[PDB]
Structures are given as structure tokens and as C-alpha cells.
Design a protein around this ligand. Sequence first.
Ligand SMILES: c1ccc2c(NCCCCCCCCNc3c4c(nc5ccccc35)CCCC4)ccnc2c1
Ligand SMILES: c1ccc2c(NCCCCCCCCNc3c4c(nc5ccccc35)CCCC4)ccnc2c1
Ligand SMILES: *[C@@H]1O[C@H](CO)[C@@H](O)[C@H](O)[C@H]1NC(C)=O
Ligand SMILES: *[C@@H]1O[C@H](CO)[C@@H](O)[C@H](O)[C@H]1NC(C)=O
Ligand SMILES: *[C@@H]1O[C@H](CO)[C@@H](O)[C@H](O)[C@H]1NC(C)=O
Ligand SMILES: *[C@@H]1O[C@H](CO)[C@@H](O)[C@H](O)[C@H]1NC(C)=O
Lengths: 528, 528
Amino acid sequence: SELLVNTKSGKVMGTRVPVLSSHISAFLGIPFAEPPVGNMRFRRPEPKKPWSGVWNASTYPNNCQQYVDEQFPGFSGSEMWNPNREMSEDCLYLNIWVPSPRPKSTTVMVWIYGGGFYSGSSTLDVYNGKYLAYTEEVVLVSLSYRVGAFGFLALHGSQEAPGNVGLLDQRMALQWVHDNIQFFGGDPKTVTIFGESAGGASVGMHILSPGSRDLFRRAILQSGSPNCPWASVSVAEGRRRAVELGRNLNCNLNSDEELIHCLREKKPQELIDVEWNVLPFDSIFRFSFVPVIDGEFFPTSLESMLNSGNFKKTQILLGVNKDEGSFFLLYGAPGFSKDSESKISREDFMSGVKLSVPHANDLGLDAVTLQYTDWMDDNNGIKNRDGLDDIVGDHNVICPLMHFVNKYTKFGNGTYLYFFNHRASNLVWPEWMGVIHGYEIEFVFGLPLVKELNYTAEEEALSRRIMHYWATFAKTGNPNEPSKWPLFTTKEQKFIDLNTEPMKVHQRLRVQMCVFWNQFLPKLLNAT
Amino acid sequence: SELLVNTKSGKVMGTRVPVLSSHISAFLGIPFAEPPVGNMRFRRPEPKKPWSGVWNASTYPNNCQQYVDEQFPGFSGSEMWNPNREMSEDCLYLNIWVPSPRPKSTTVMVWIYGGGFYSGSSTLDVYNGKYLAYTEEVVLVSLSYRVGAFGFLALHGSQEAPGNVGLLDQRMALQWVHDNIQFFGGDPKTVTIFGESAGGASVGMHILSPGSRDLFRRAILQSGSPNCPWASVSVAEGRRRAVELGRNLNCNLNSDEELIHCLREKKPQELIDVEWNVLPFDSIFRFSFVPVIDGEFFPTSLESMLNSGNFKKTQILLGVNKDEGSFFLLYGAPGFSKDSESKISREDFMSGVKLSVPHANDLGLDAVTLQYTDWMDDNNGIKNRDGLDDIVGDHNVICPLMHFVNKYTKFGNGTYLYFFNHRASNLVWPEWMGVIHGYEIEFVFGLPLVKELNYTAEEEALSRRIMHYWATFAKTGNPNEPSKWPLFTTKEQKFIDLNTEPMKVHQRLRVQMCVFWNQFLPKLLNAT
Ligand SMILES: c1ccc2c(NCCCCCCCCNc3c4c(nc5ccccc35)CCCC4)ccnc2c1
Ligand SMILES: c1ccc2c(NCCCCCCCCNc3c4c(nc5ccccc35)CCCC4)ccnc2c1
Ligand SMILES: *[C@@H]1O[C@H](CO)[C@@H](O)[C@H](O)[C@H]1NC(C)=O
Ligand SMILES: *[C@@H]1O[C@H](CO)[C@@H](O)[C@H](O)[C@H]1NC(C)=O
Ligand SMILES: *[C@@H]1O[C@H](CO)[C@@H](O)[C@H](O)[C@H]1NC(C)=O
Ligand SMILES: *[C@@H]1O[C@H](CO)[C@@H](O)[C@H](O)[C@H]1NC(C)=O
């Protein structure tokens, strides 16, 4: 049977799924790690014990325990990101979509979901891999990994909660794909890992980490990079947040063993209920439990690794969206709201910049404010709103990705950079938010191909070229079929716009603002 | 006789001069102070002893001792600024142009020449007051004052060389005009002092100084303001430059009396020969001997005086030129030269910014460089040249004048601001220098009215409207004849362009760059 596959870990039985009036096989909920429950909470994952019999993989697995967005109850714009399966600590599973008939040895793509390392699910409708598997003939895999304190509580020096275990969950899934994907028709020597936001930062983290490098071939990073200011913390800060979490739960804090033991008896929801109380500052675009620069998964600081070429050399394809920051302002900055144009007063602008660069002294806040204010029209509400939108996006996503791409390209074997600026005709979010963080995903996964979702014919065409650029790059290391997406080089720094208009090539994506965020501001904060 | 005038100091005999095929009277070289020679060098000026008989005022007086520009021998562009009379320490005289027939009580304008407080003459062809006296029916006066060490050597605490004596020379001339101008037909209750560059800074200094305020009615400042970074130094820095000057002449430095005595025996040219050796930094647009914030002429810091309204409240008219910095780069920054377009390399740009902001640490130099560099085209030679031109002009002239005008307007009784951007059709300087520091002067003094100077008909019309704006403002406190130059207000901040095209009104002259120079950079240099 086409739906039965024998792996090194046991046999699994998939299910047949319809796709664009045809069909493919899906193997949903395959376990790749032992359930990280009880005494196993906070620990490195352990490989799944092989099973006898047949594993039923006809349905989506549970999602990992996480905070749930209730800001706009039933609004599809925000609920499309919430877990759509029951939550459980028993959540380490992966999903596979396989073309029909079963390939022999074709291109593999492994998706790593975003969600600020505190949320995310591999089962969201926007991540349904059937359209991409089908249209491009690739074996598509989506893995899962522990988020929040369950995945990133870090007490460096302890083996019970070493930190980075969520990243180790991702690695374990990649080890499973390396070891078993050949049985589903995938070529384990041609796997591309791709992800968005925290997922793109994760992808970049595996390019960096010695222990993950050999488990994949090429990489795609969407709106995220490893050096993002919100993607990692030092071991001292990780330790301090772990202790502060225990303090919120009235834990005995005399020793790591006491803290960890106390944290292990709490129900999942108790940790989720106070998780956000450990941030050191009043901030936006910062998350409590994230990867730690531990000297193991990351041997040295990310910057020295980037500087010395200490990373996997291969091809990468990556890019950003036009308005990466808008949704973080909607959720956390005064003056922004879902149902108004959100013209911002000068005082809310100033309140907005303090929230955006939480780690800055007064001089730093003045430098950011001067850099983004039009002083001949400072009370322009639209300009204040847009300026703040760009500050959040430039500082949290764009400039850190541009710093990564320039450092990577000096040692890599090929880079393709894009700027996604198409605002979907059917967007449910207000206009002011523009081309939102996460909204290039539906095009990568091909939702515009399904008529009922109401996209335009040109939106369907855009989705088909992106899907084909992504799969062709996964297959060959080049998005182009032998009108050309040129290679990004350290000399020319070319990139393309990705929208419904004839491809345009540009150069030096946001150089002006990024010299400010990547060179001047850090120099300024370090001296003052 | 029309050419004979009796003053409180004695009788003076003028000469009749032709002007635009008519004539007026000129009283050249009237003495207003005792010669500041011998033991009087460096001291406050003393009033001229009255003389019996008739003072011959038919010829220009000597110019004060100063450094002489020899960079382009015989080039009219630079020689038009050099002294055109023999030099002498005996140089405290004033000149008067009087309409014919002799007025009874008309508007008086007193010109104070620029020249960085180290040079300048009241006798330059560009300062000939006959055209303005004639066309606008005003009594035009040009005074003189000691420059360089002779006028500004400052050893605070000593009465032998207290500093600011050159400013006291100007004051003495204003006291003479107040006391005697009625005999030449001038109204001493309606005198406007006006000046350019160091002369405009001086004008602003008399608006500030309690001891000078009552001696004039209204003021005009051209490309200069009192708070310019090159226009004053602290008493400790003045002292240090005086000592360093003595050290260059092998003077005994044990006491002020020893230093001063030694400096008084040196010939004038010996002081001029080493004068430039005392600057504390490798700089551009900085001069050795300038006014000192002494607690007497300036009771407190200029900024606290501006902040508290501690200054003369009246009407002012002032403005700047488009390319104030170009000539200082020509003379002192690598890569600029008179006969080439002066496209500047990135390294010369960087060398240029270090010279321009001599008082800045590394962080400050980076902030200036980032603010003026187009990072998507950083090797553009024209952009590097123009960027440096704007850095010099914004920092040395424009932004300090804009800070002065906004502080003044909160307490004053009327402000008119202009932006002079007409490049003269007959300019002998290369194109790259644009609308040069000092080149609005020939229009204020009406040289375009004389056919042989080869200006265009529209240039003659522009000169006539400027002359009439200046004299009408001198007469009434408003440049407009009862198309309107609007009042600058702290709310609207309107100003006009001054050129051959139909008047255009704008707002917030260089606000963007000036928030950088006036608020951010000083905050940055003070913290780091
Ligand atoms: C108390 C108070 C606040 C919080 C909190 N506040 C987070 C607000 C900032 C974050 C809210 C965004 C929702 C994620 N969902 C979204 C994601 C993406 N794009 C989105 C676009 C629009 C709206 C939501 C999006 C792209 C892929 C990743 C996920 C979190 C946890 N616990 C708390 C506890
Ligand atoms: C050794 C080395 C250098 C110097 C020095 N170097 C000054 C260079 C910088 C200054 C040179 C400019 C000439 C003034 N003459 C000019 C003035 C104005 N505009 C001008 C425009 C173009 C050229 C000259 C101008 C507007 C009114 C004020 C005077 C000075 C003394 N001693 C020295 C001794
Ligand atoms: C597979 O498991 C799901 C669990 O809901 C069930 O509905 C389905 O019938 C199962 N099929 C088999 C063959 O066990
Ligand atoms: C990638 O590597 C191959 C083989 O080492 C080399 O020939 C090619 O030029 C490289 N391509 C890029 C983009 O550097
Ligand atoms: C005035 O002085 C000048 C000095 O050069 C002289 O040429 C002129 O003849 C003098 N006239 C009188 C009346 O003394
Ligand atoms: C100047 O002062 C007069 C009289 O004090 C006043 O009436 C007038 O409004 C003032 N004008 C300005 C420009 O402030």
C-alpha cells in the first residue's frame, strides 16, 4: 500500500488527502522523540523508542503547550496563528506530505514554525503542506518543538534544564528526516530547512551550530535571522529569568535542583500564566524564553561566529516583508488599534520608541527618534505611525537579517535575497498594517491556488512563482529555472521585489537605516 | 559748505564723490579712538581727543594689521577681501557716506565687517557705501576695529589685555555715531547696525551685551550669529592661546605683565607670523583670537543669556547663503582645489569631517558622517563634496543662526529671515562652491547697479530690492513697503528665498540638519 511505510522506528499508516481535485498521501503525527513529560520536562529530548505494529498517522498531533491569543476572539486574522489542536506537553511529532505516486528520491523541504519561541504549531491551516508537495513534487515535512519555558528555560550548568532544548527538539526531527525520509521517497542528501520569524532565526541557528550542520543541505530564512535582538539571551539573563519564573510560582530558590523540581510539579498553564512576568523591560518584540548562547549549541557569541566563518557553508535564500513591525505595535504600543487608522500623536510615538528599543539609554532613544522623525512635519499622525512601524521592523527583523546576509555571503556558496511587498487583496487586517509579519507564508504554501480563499488571478500567479522559486532552490541551490533573480554578492548586494508586478532588481536593501542599527547605535550604546 | 561738518570732536572736511552719474558727500577716515599703539596695544580703546582745525576726511584710512591672503595672487575672487590700504596699528577710523543735499534727520546704517575676527577692512570695494547711501537716502557708516591678537588677545584678570577690545572698538564707534551723526544729517535714534560673518556675530554680540544695547536701534545679521562655534572662547582657552602665542615668540612667561610686555615689543608682523600656531586643533573654520565670555562684555554664557531673554529686544533681519562652507574647504581640506570640480573621495570626506568638527570624539565623527552620507551611493564624488560643503555651512553658520533666531524671536519685537541662493552670473569662483560665504554682500551694497561690473538686468533688480528691503527695515523695523516678506514667528518660522525668481515663502530653514547640530550632537558629545 501507498499509505504504508516502514521506517527504522516502526511502520506508519498515512491517509490519502485531496488537493486541487487530485490527491496525495499524508503521514500526520509521526513521533520523533519520547514524550517530554514529568521528570523529562526541560530536559534534552530523547529519541522515540521503536514501536511494533502500525502507527496510525492519519490525523494531526497535539500542539505544544503555549499562551493563546484572545485579543480578537474569532477574528480569523489572529486565530489563524493559535493552536488548532488540543495542547499537550506530549507534542513532539512531525508531519509528512508525499506526492502520489510515492517518489523514489526527490527534493525534501522541512518547515520550522515561528511564534517568538513561545508559541506556534505545525498544524495551522496556513502551514498545510499539501499544495506545495503536490504542485512542486517535493516531500514536505513540518516538525514541531517545545516552546516557552518548556523549550527554553535555561539554568546553565544544570543538566536538568540546560536550555536550548527546543532547538534540540528541532535537531532530533532533522536527524529523523535524515535517517528515514528515503522510505517516503525523499532524498536525505537534498533537504532544505525553511522557516519564518523564530523559525527563520532557528534555521539560521542550525546553520551556525556545529551539531546541526550536517543534517541538512540548504536553507531558507523568512523574516528572521539568528542574530535577531529577540532571538537569544546570555546564560546569565536566561538564569535570571528562570529564577524570576520560579519566584512568580512561590518556588524554593535555594538551588537549581530545588527550582527545577518546583517548576516540574506545576501544571502547564501555571507556567504560561506568569511566563511574561520575567521580561527585564517594558518592551515590544521580546519574548521570555528563548535560545541561550551557552558555549555548546552555540560555541561562541553569534557575532564572532559570523565574523570568523564559523558556520555551514552552502546556499541560502531569504528575505523580509515591507511592514514587519506593524502587528507588534497593534498588540503592545499605545495609540494603535485594530479598527482605526492609528494615526499616532507625538507623545505616543515617543512612548512607542521607548518600548521598541527597551535596552536603550536616553541618548540612544534620542538617536532613534531623530533618525525616524520628519522635523518639518512632526505632528503628522500617519508619519508618526509609519515611522514607528519602520523602527520596529528595521530593528527587529530587517537590519539584523541584512547584517546576517552580508556576513554570510562573504563565506557562503550562494545567496538569494527578496523583499516581499504585496498586500493581499483579501487581507482581514486594516490597511495601516501594510505587508504584515507572517503574510508571505500563505503565498509560500500556495493558499492562493484555492478558489474559495478568494485571492486574485495575479495572486495565484505570484504564489505559483514563489512556490516554484522555493522548490527549485531547494532542489538545486538556485531559485532560477536554467526573468532572473540575481545572486546577492557582497559587491553588488542585489535583491528582488516579490509582488504581482514585473520583477524589479534593486540593491542595498535599507542600507541607510541599517548602517544606523547595525553600526552606529550599538557603538553609541556601548560608549554611553 | 556741504563738505564741512562740525562735530563734538572737531571739524571735518569731506569729499564729493560721483555715484551712478550723480554725486554725494563722503567723509572718509574720521578718527573715533586714540591710536592703539605702543603701551596702548591690547588695551581698551580710549576716545579720540578733540582736535582744533579741520580734519581732512577726503581719503580712506589705513586698514588694521592683519594676515594677508596670498593663495591666488591677483585673483580678484580672493584679493577683493585683502586690505587695499597700507596696514597700521593706527587704524581706528570710521567712514560716512551722506546723501546730497545733506539730510536733516534720516535713517542711519552702520556696517561692521567680517573676516573671522583676524582680518577685514572697512575700505574694500565691496563695502563702498555710496550706492546704498545714494539709492536709499540713508547715511551709511562703516566702522573699523582691531582684529587678530591686537583686538582679541585675552588674559582675563589683567587690565592690560582684558580681551574683547576689538568689540569695544566697535562700541566706541557706535558711541561716536550716537553722539555725532545728527551733524551729518543722520537720526541717532534710528541707527541699524549690520554686518556679515564675524560682523554679523559682532552685531549679535552688541544685541547681547548690556553695555552696547542702548547705542543702536535695530539689527541685521548676515551669515553670522553670536553663538557661532568659532565666534568666542572661554577665558581659560583665551588665556592658553595668549600664553602659547608668547611661547612662539620666546617670551618670558612667568606673569601676565611679563607676557604682555614681551608681546608689546614685537613688531606687528611677528605676531601675525605665528598667530595661527595657537589653535588647539587641526581644524577648519576656527580662528585664533576671538571674543571671550568674560563676565563683563558678556555677563554670563551666551546660551543662558539667550535662554533668559537677557538681551536687547527690538527687530532683527538676518539670514544665510546656500553654500556657506565651500570656501573654507577650498582653503583647508584635502581634495578641494580652485580649478577642478573637487569631486571628493571617501577618505578625503572622512578627513574633511575630522577638520570640520575639531572638538569631536569618534562617536561624534561617526554621527556626523552617518548624517551626511548617502549609503546607497557612498563613492559618489559630487555627493561627498556637497555633503562636506553642507556640514561646514550647517555647523558653522546656518544651524547656529537658526538656534539664535528661534531663541531671539521668543522675546524680540519682530524677525525677518532670508535664504540667499542666487549664484551671480559673473562669479569668478568655480561652480562647485555655489552661493559662497560673503557673496550676498555685493548685492546688499548694490554693485549690480554699475554696468561695468557686468551683472544681468535681473541681478540689478535683485540688488535694488535687497537694498530697499534693508533700508526700509532700517527705517521702520519692517522690510516691507506698507509681494510680502512675512514675519518669522516661533510658531510658523517662515522665511523667504532671496534670488531672481518670484519670491517664495518656506518654513523651518534646515530644521532636519539643525535638530542634529543643535540638540543631538551636543547632547552626544556631553555624555560620551
Ligand atoms: C500577559 C500579557 C501579554 C502576553 C503576551 N503578549 C504577546 C504580544 C506580542 C505577540 C502577539 C502576536 C500573536 C502571534 N501571532 C502572529 C504570528 C505572526 N504574524 C501575526 C500577524 C498578525 C497578528 C498575529 C500574528 C507570524 C508568525 C509568528 C506568529 C504573550 C504571552 N503571554 C502574555 C501574558
Ligand atoms: C598659517 C597658515 C594658515 C593661516 C590662515 N588661514 C586661514 C584660512 C581660512 C580663511 C581664508 C579665507 C580668506 C578670507 N576672505 C574671505 C572672506 C569672505 N568670503 C570669502 C570667499 C572666498 C574666498 C575668501 C573669502 C566673507 C567675509 C569675510 C572674509 C590665516 C591666518 N594665518 C595663517 C598662518
Ligand atoms: C486512526 O486514528 C484516528 C484517531 O481519531 C481514528 O479516527 C481512525 O479511525 C484511526 N484509524 C485506524 C485504522 O486505526
Ligand atoms: C559554489 O561552490 C562551487 C564549488 O566549490 C564553485 O564552483 C562555485 O563558484 C560556488 N558558487 C558561489 C555562488 O560561490
Ligand atoms: C587731504 O589729504 C590728502 C592726503 O593724501 C591730500 O591728497 C589732499 O590734497 C588733502 N587736502 C587738503 C585740503 O588738505
Ligand atoms: C512690537 O511691540 C509693539 C509695542 O510694544 C507691539 O504692539 C507689537 O505687536 C510688537 N510686534 C511684534 C512683531 O511683536
